């Protein structure tokens, strides 16, 4: 990049000789430093999985929320710095909340991903506010497209994914998703499998323990978005530990 | 070192004896610097070519 003493990396309404702002790139490192969020598109729903690091042994699930329920059919799984994740969560919740209430049907995702990414990007343009140093995914079950999963980067670029991972081992996680067929597989089986990828990522010589938050929006819940039921949640983690060894 | 201004005088002189004659320098720059460092032997030598040149210009 550059480390010029006036602007370019110290502002973000200033483009480099090539046309890029260094400030968004510094932010892009931030998703890499902490734990992964995986999310794969099914066709009966979407299954999300974020490993929440047990930093303190005096926490309970619902602490350092990486998993948000955006609406009652829309999820958001984030990776990277949690403060920029919260902002992104707040905007997403309001955008989803007006659409169910008013229209009366489930939100087609592809527009939603574009709007939120517009929000990210509008802030990048400005030098008065910051690029968002989070990468996040949105997932929904719709009656106009079925399941959709889109991943939006800290740059405000939106692409749809059959199966994504954003986090501290994208390369290892994406590849495991490639091998498996989860693209059009049933949500129930997927729960176990998403957890199992989280198990590979996690180390018992870089992490102590994590608490699994998965989120359903699929056939068990009848398309309702809830954070994983305690029985199911446990079952899926139980499989993850047992199958490696 | 030392030979660099000595060259200039003779070549420039050839023109004068067999006058009219044209001395044509392709690119006058790498010598026509308005700034010399003048602390290393290398800088000093360029400074000596320019010094000879000016003198010689009146000489023609």
């Amino acid at each position: 990049m550059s480390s010029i003493g006036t602007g370019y990396d110290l502002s973000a309404s200033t483009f480099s000789p090539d046309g890029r702002v260094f400030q968004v790139e510094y932010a892009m490192k931030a998703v890499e430093n902490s734990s992964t969020a995986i999310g794969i598109r099914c066709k009966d729903g979407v299954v999300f999985g974020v490993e929440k690091l047990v930093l303190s042994k005096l926490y309970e699930e619902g602490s350092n929320k990486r998993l948000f329920n955006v609406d009652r059919h829309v999820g958001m799984a984030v990776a990277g710095l949690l403060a920029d994740a919260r902002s992104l969560a707040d905007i997403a919740r309001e955008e989803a909340s007006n659409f169910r209430s008013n229209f009366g049907y489930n939100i087609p995702l592809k527009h939603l991903a574009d709007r939120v990414a517009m929000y990210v990007h509008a802030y990048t343009l400005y030098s008065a506010v910051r690029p968002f140093g989070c990468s996040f995914m949105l997932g929904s079950y719709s009656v106009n497209d079925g399941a959709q999963l889109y991943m939006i980067d800290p740059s405000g670029v939106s692409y749809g994914y059959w199966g994504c991972a954003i986090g501290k081992a994208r390369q290892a996680a994406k590849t495991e998703i490639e091998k498996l067929q989860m693209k059009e597989m049933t949500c129930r089986d997927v729960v176990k499998e998403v957890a199992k990828i989280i198990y590979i990522v996690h180390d018992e010589v870089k992490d102590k323990a994590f608490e699994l938050e998965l989120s359903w929006v699929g056939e068990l819940t009848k398309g309702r978005h809830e954070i994983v039921p305690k029985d199911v949640r446990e079952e899926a983690e139980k499989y993850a530990k047992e199958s490696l060894k | 070192l030392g030979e660099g201004p000595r060259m200039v005088r003779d070549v420039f002189r050839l023109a004068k004896e067999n006058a009219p004659a044209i001395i044509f320098i392709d690119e006058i720059d790498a010598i026509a610097t308005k700034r010399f460092d003048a602390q290393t032997g290398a800088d000093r030598e360029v400074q000596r070519i320019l010094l000879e040149l000016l003198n010689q210009m009146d000489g023609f």
């Binding site: 550059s2 990396d9 890499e32 930093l55 005096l58 870089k206 | -």
Partner: protein, 294 residues
């Protein structure tokens, strides 16, 4: 042949002798010094990374037959990046001693020199020095020092420094060998470099060291407790949970400093106050008051 030294007598120019081709005095400094072992177990945490460096650097040289069996080329170079104190240099040393591997100390500014054009010839001499030693590790500190090209400079900007970054590429293209010799490149900021110097397949492997986490803190603290006393009351691992994340150099530094208060008192034992005082010793002060920040 051209490049060879030969003696010639001043009193009348006859060839006194024939001498073989040889490097400058500066280059002699650049050759081996060797670094001692931190041992893989003993250098705390960063487990996934021990594998990445070991595989890339030491294995193609020492455990060469397995690579020949794989059929791959040796790496042209590796990069170590991330913010400091993550054990980038630290891991490399561990590897250097155990296997036995030539680690060429090189200081990045040393290539640049007062003598014009010659500074670059030093870069050639250094790469050359590795060819003969092959396989080699050329350990380079601070890549910013080799230079950065982006010049339109007509006002100053030296351009000894311009030559020296350009020269690395020259040596670095395939024409002049560099397949077998690895360059261990290290920089805290790759936020100041250009793509010509960096970028994959010129320095093939790119190794990350992200911020640590609790377990990684746990292993470092455990190695450290053996050497000097550490309080039951608080351990850096325990301390980290309340606070947030911190790098491995930071964890050892607070710890040495905690002992320092204790040594000063005249006790070999450590208290919780010595560690808390330690956090405060790292921060800056100019009004020293926590009763205004009460």
């Amino acid at each position: 042949k051209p490049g060879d030294l030969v003696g010639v007598n001043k009193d009348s120019y006859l060839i006194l002798e024939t001498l073989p081709t040889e490097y400058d005095s500066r280059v002699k400094a650049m050759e081996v010094d060797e670094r001692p072992t931190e041992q893989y177990s003993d250098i705390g945490g960063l487990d996934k990374q021990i594998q990445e460096l070991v595989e890339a650097i030491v294995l193609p040289m020492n455990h060469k037959e397995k690579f020949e069996n794989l059929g791959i080329q040796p790496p042209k170079g590796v990069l170590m990046y991330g913010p400091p104190g993550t054990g980038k240099t630290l891991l490399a040393r561990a590897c250097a001693a155990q296997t036995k591997a030539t680690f060429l100390k090189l200081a990045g500014p040393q290539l640049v020199q007062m003598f014009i054009g010659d500074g670059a010839k030093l870069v050639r001499d250094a790469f050359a020095l590795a060819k003969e030693k092959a396989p080699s590790i050329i350990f380079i500190d601070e890549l910013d020092a080799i230079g950065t090209k982006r010049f339109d400079s007509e006002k100053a900007g030296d351009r000894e420094v311009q030559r020296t970054m350009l020269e690395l590429l020259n040596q670095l293209d395939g024409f002049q060998p560099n397949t077998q010799v690895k360059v261990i490149a290290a920089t805290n900021r790759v936020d100041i470099l250009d793509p010509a110097l960096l970028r994959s397949g010129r320095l093939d492997r790119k190794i990350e060291f992200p911020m640590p986490n609790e377990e990684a803190r746990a292993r470092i603290m455990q190695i450290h407790s053996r050497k000097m006393n550490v309080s039951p009351d608080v351990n850096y691992e325990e301390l980290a949970r309340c606070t947030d994340d911190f790098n491995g150099a930071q964890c050892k530094a607070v710890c040495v400093e905690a002992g320092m208060i204790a040594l000063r008192r005249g006790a070999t034992e450590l208290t919780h106050e010595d560690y808390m005082e330690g956090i405060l010793e790292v921060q800056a002060k100019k009004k020293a008051n926590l009763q205004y920040y009460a």
